[PDB]
A = this chain, B = another copy of it.
Amino acid sequence: SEFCWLTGLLEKWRFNAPEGLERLLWIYLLIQNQYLTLLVQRDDMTELREETEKSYLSRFKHAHGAGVYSQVRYLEGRFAPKSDPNKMQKLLFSVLRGYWEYLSAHMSMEWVHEKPLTISQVLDNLELVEPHGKCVELALVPHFIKRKPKNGEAYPHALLFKDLKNQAAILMDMLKSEPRLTGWIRGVDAAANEMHAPPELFCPLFRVLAKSGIAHFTYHVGEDFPHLISGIRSIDDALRFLPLRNGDRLGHCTA
């Protein structure tokens, strides 16, 4: 609708345009551009429920691109963990159902449940898909969000650690409640900022998560270091303390 409207308006203004309406189009473009700049700079409930699984389905179609064959094969999806177990179950159900919708749209094959409506039936449908490389292969890596260190509270990062421990708790009890989710929940990330939480904060979190079958860990090194030596030390600390096994990754090693 956005493209068709503008193409029609520009077609009717091919040779001349009224001055007032021409300025109206100018104002609309300026407002849209300023909002887009505000959004991108800010990036680095009801609104989420407005799209829900539709946004994820559009994401997988966008990753697939035009043509019968997907231009992207291996896609690792990052989502913000939620402290509410019910919200978490809805979140992963929407993402997985959208992935099944993308696969069903591109691949025509027998499905156990035409309308799964739950995680277990979604995994029942998804386990029939074989790795063939013509579609998008999805891996889910939730990214823990570090926060500001509150004053006092024994050790400097106490409330933040409790919040991260809680978020890990819902992730763990779900994984034991559905063992097949270990084939889709493939990693754990921590991408908020480096000053707010040091890499050594997530070491107990990552080691305990490793015993839950996560099997992969990536850590974002926030590149707002006060000094270049500080950032280099931050990357070294991540290698030294975090349980990064063979094949793991580190995020944004600009230092």
The interface of chain A, by Cβ under 8 A from chain B, is 68-69, 130-131
CA distance A131 to B69 in the complex (A): 9
Task: Name the B residues within 8 Å of A131 (CB-CB).
Answer: 68-69
| Residues of B contacting A68 in the complex (Cβ-Cβ under 8 angstroms) | 130-131
Q: How far, in whole Å, are A131 and B131 apart by their CA atoms in the complex?
A: 18
Nearest-neighbor residue (CB-CB) of A134 within chain B = B130
Sample 3 A-B pairs with CB under 8 A, ordered by A number: A68-B130, A68-B131, A69-B131
Q: Which 3 A-B pairs have the closest CB atoms?
A: A68-B130, A69-B131, A68-B131
Residues of B within 8 A of A130 (CB): 68
With both chains docked as a complex, state the minimum distance between the C-beta of A49 and any C-beta of chain B, in angstroms: 37
Alpha-carbon distance A130/B131, docked complex (angstroms): 18
Q: Give Cα distance in the complex from A38 to B69, angstroms.
A: 48
Residue of B nearest to A67 (CB): B131
Expressed in whole angstroms, the minimum distance between the Cβ of A4 and any Cβ of chain B is: 20
CA distance A137 to B131 in the complex (A): 20
A109 CB to nearest chain B CB (Å): 13
A190 to chain B, nearest CB (A): 31
The smallest beta-carbon distance between A46 and chain B, in angstroms, is: 42
CB nearest to A68 among chain B residues: B130
* Cα of A69 to Cα of B131 in the assembled complex, Å: 9
- CB contacts (< 8 Å) of A69 on chain B: these are 131
Distance of A180 from chain B, by nearest CB (Å): 15
